[PDB]
Design a binder for these strands. Structure first.
Ligand SMILES: [Cl-]
Lengths: 309, 309
DNA sequence: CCATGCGCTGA
DNA sequence: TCAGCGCATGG
DNA sequence: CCATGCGCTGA
DNA sequence: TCAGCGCATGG
């Protein structure tokens, strides 16, 4: 997941109200702009900090790659200088109550500014350009300053969108892969959504939500332990590579907010606000023993899915 | 959603272990069979009752339309009579502890048996054929007899698969509609998953899971009130046509297990096992008041989504 | 009238 | 269990 | 050296 | 507000 700084002082209202980022393709003499170029490197699920009148107003999630769009008519005078031919990105705006003025924290920030294409000068004054790369180290500091409601937008949200993208790719490769017969194809694709032979088999091994106790099949999700995306065709359909979970536990476990030791002990990530568990009346503690086959898979989960610091 | 009866006395082990239904295409002399024909009318998410040794052993969900497949080699002698060229369906088997003997309920059932292609004779003896249509009125009686753990497989599970299918259709028609520009297309498609400008807007109106109290954006789902599927392009992107919900509340509300009055009072469906709410520590009662625009949408939900009997 | 078919019955 | 007896369906 | 640009300043 | 004044970047 990549981070971005978007200086929007001229047109922030229009871009937030429109739920978009927009720039020209080139500068007004036809020449290449690294800033406008950056538009084409923005991935769905990449975080974008909106900066205007010296303040960070939005922690944004990008919901598109840059697509060829003409200047917004609602820009008026404020964007008369910009070429009509432009890049547009759909940005999931998230307003933040705590709008940090970066300049006022420059002492903390400056060391994490990149040497070239910094959004800020060394005095902490914004550079005159539209879009800059934000190195993850700098990103982590901006986030620290804005506090909770920046972490809220990233962890188990924005940083899940690229995972989803990687899984979609794999689902297309399966559906065009001759090497696996039409039944395997069908049962692999269905196993992803927790359907087909995988679900049947899981129910043979487990009978209820390990955490909540619910046994009713219509209120349980057939989540994998080792995620579908990284599992071989054997493990994608293995009943032992699965847990029946209530949707909110599936949520917490799928994203690695909680995991389990081999002994059943719940492990809670530092990234999970304990308030969540209190609000959903979920206790820490032992949720029963795992089979040897299960413990193999639950280990991969701890080391690869479960969010560490 | 269509229901089906599949008589599997000869090959049930093989078909359940394989997570499939299979029949020949035709009878021994190339002649047409309405029963084998029925294979091609089976829709994903259609419910299929497995009948063997006079008992219903499975309430199945179909995970495929019928596809051209040769006889399973594991049938051996037991299926030597059947042509090799056959139909195959992927069946999500769900075993039931309460295995009803339909014959023993025949006096109650008989009137709801169809005139032609009944799976049962009037004495309640199974007919010698593989697959029969089950009309919804007869279906409702079988379900009544098997009790909860048939309802488990159907309500908010099997009957959601066909909804998903209808929604996918709509998402493809949007993406091929010349009349709506590339931004509308993108924001309608993303609004479905609770993403893009719809999410931004919803956050303007609502700030927390109405039920659980969770305020953290990474543990909240942007569910619509009036479902995406039947909302006009205005309502698909309306912030007032939405609720921020914890995943397990999104689950219960999106499928109509719970709804709300205009006053905030939770309404619990007859189809929701109250055990669920106790296990997830959710109380009935008032979950705060709705805006007038919200009350319009919440009403449609009560009458169209919220499961009544 | 005859043929075919994933049920049905245990001498 | 393996055969024989049905009934429902269709040529 | 010259050109360009979603910040910044103040009348 | 919007012209004019910077710095950052590149031809
Ligand atoms: Cl109102």
């Amino acid at each position: 997941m990549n981070y971005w700084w978007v200086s929007q002082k001229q047109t922030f209202k229009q871009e937030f109200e429109g739920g978009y980022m927009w720039s020209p393709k080139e500068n007004k003499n036809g020449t290449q702009s690294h800033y406008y170029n950056n538009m084409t490197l923005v991935q769905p699920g990449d975080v974008v900090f909106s900066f205007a009148n010296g303040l960070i107003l939005s922690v944004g999630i990008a919901r598109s790659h840059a697509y060829s769009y003409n200047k917004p008519t609602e820009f008026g005078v404020a964007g008369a200088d910009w070429a009509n031919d432009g890049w547009k990105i759909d940005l999931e705006y998230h307003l933040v109550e705590n709008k940090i003025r970066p300049k006022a924290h420059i002492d903390f920030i400056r060391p994490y500014l990149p040497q070239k294409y910094s959004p800020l000068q060394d005095n902490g004054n914004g550079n005159q350009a539209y879009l800059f790369s934000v190195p993850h180290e700098l990103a982590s500091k901006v986030v620290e300053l804005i506090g909770s409601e920046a972490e809220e937008v990233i962890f188990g949200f924005a940083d899940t969108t690229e995972i989803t993208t990687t899984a979609d790719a794999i689902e297309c490769q399966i559906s065009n892969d001759a090497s696996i017969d039409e039944t395997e194809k069908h049962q692999l694709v269905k196993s992803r959504r927790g359907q087909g032979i995988f679900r049947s088999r899981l129910e043979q091994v487990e009978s209820r939500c390990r955490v909540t106790g619910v046994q009713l099949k219509n209120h349980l999700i057939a989540s994998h332990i080792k995620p579908w995306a990284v599992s071989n065709n054997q493990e994608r359909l293995d009943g032992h590579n699965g847990l029946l979970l209530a949707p909110h536990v599936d949520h917490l476990f799928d994203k690695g907010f909680i995991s389990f030791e081999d002994n059943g002990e719940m492990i809670v990530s530092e990234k999970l606000n304990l308030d969540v568990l209190k609000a959903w009346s979920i206790s820490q503690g032992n949720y029963g023993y795992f089979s040897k086959q299960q413990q193999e898979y639950m280990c991969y989960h701890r080391e690869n899915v479960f969010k560490k610091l």
